[PDB]
């Protein structure tokens, strides 16, 4: 029938987590989506021939380490770690997010994809090589995306799904 996959999109404010989600769910580019709104969206898609129900959590709110957020977050089976290629700070923050995932899953190997969004922008302060290097040090895939032009968006989420399959073996 279906396989459900619980995905969680994380990373710093403004990198495009909402835009990426809404682009996948609803196929349009949201210009100014309330930065404080956290919610889950569900989507039925076929990926490599398998009909999937993607439960996607788009994180937002205040920074804080509360027990039910911990429990909200550890239901994730796979994590999109998103930075913007024009936001150096958001790239440097990726390690903190991967540490928070590792802690709440209590595991050293959690399915994860590194995503460099806003790749449609000319102002590029994070190189591709810098991000690939980080991705290879985690053993995880890296993809560049643009929620505005939709390039790479579907691939980034399906690639994560694929990482969840391999983890399951
Ligand atoms: C993201 C995440 C993944 C897995 C488990 C988690 C468990 C608890 C909490 C988390 N999350 C909550 C939001 C957040 C978080 N960590 C930051 O780190 C910002 C800077 C970087 C270095 C430390 N810190 C000073 N920021 C968060 N916020 C998001 C993005 C900005 C901020 C406010 N709006 C939404 C942590 C878990
Ligand atoms: N040029 C460009 N702008 C983007 C892209 N993705 C998001 N944005 C814009 O960046 C801002 C923050 O996006 P949002 O999805 O709210 O980021 P979030 O805080 O991670 O949810 C919004 O103004 C978006 O229109 C992109 O791929 N390219
Ligand atoms: Mg948002």
Author numbering: 0 to 168
From the primary publication:
The oncogenic impacts of the KRAS gene were first reported in 1980s, making KRAS one of the first identified oncogenes. It is known that KRAS protein functions as a molecular switch: it responds to upstream EGFR activation and regulates the downstream MAPK and PI3K/mTOR pathways, eventually controlling cell proliferation, differentiation, and survival. Clinical data have implicated the driver mutations of the KRAS residue Gly12 (G12), and basic studies have shown that such mutations impair both this enzyme’s intrinsic and GTPase-activating protein (GAP)-stimulated GTP hydrolysis activity, promoting oncogenesis. Despite these progresses with inhibitors of KRAS(G12C), the most prevalent and oncogenic G12 mutant variant is KRAS(G12D), which is estimated to impact more than 50% patients with pancreatic ductal adenocarcinoma.
Compared with TH-Z816, bicyclic compounds TH-Z827, TH-Z835, and TH-Z837 had unfavorable ΔH changes yet favorable ΔS changes, indicating that the binding affinity (ΔG) increase of these bicyclic compounds can be attributed to ΔS improvement. Our data confirmed that both TH-Z827 and TH-Z835 are able to interact with Asp12 and form a salt bridge for both GDP-bound and GMPPNP-bound KRAS(G12D). SOS-catalyzed nucleotide exchange assays also showed that TH-Z827 exerted a nearly 10-fold stronger inhibition for KRAS(G12D) than for KRAS(G12C) (IC50 = 2.4 μM vs IC50 = 20 μM).
